[PDB]
Design a protein around this ligand. Structure first.
Ligand SMILES: [Sr+2]
Ligand SMILES: [Sr+2]
Length: 129
């Protein structure tokens, strides 16, 4: 039996909210089935670009109707815990089946801790290897 991987390209984000002083330093956490991989941070940027590629071992478990990807965008803090900008959960059901394909996932709204749209978005490309 062959190994399959979920491929996530973190492309960019837009309209990250301004901070009172200085500028936010965005960094994205990508979580698939509790495995977390991060991007690099981008310094002092409201519209960051990464073009970073992450791949997760599916470990023989196929994608199904309920499969999803978690995204958390935070503002890097050198001292202690980074600051939340927003989250998204992305439905992966369009990748189900045995056909390798990639799809764009554009203008994904990032939601704050109250679940409100922040006006910021992230763009991904996600594929089934
Ligand atoms: Sr900064
Ligand atoms: Sr910061």
């Amino acid at each position: 039996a062959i190994t399959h991987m979920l491929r996530v390209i973190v492309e960019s984000a837009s309209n990250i909210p301004k901070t009172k002083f200085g500028k936010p330093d965005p960094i994205v956490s990508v979580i698939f089935k509790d495995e977390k991989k991060k991007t690099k941070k981008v310094d002092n940027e409201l519209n960051p670009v990464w073009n970073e590629i992450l791949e997760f071992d599916l470990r023989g478990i196929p994608l199904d109707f309920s499969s999803s990807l978690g995204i958390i965008v935070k503002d890097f803090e050198t001292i202690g815990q980074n600051k939340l900008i927003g989250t998204a959960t992305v439905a992966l059901k369009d990748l189900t089946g045995d056909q390798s394909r990639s799809l764009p996932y554009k203008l994904i709204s990032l939601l704050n801790e109250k679940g409100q749209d922040t006006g910021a978005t992230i763009d991904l490309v996600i594929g089934y290897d």
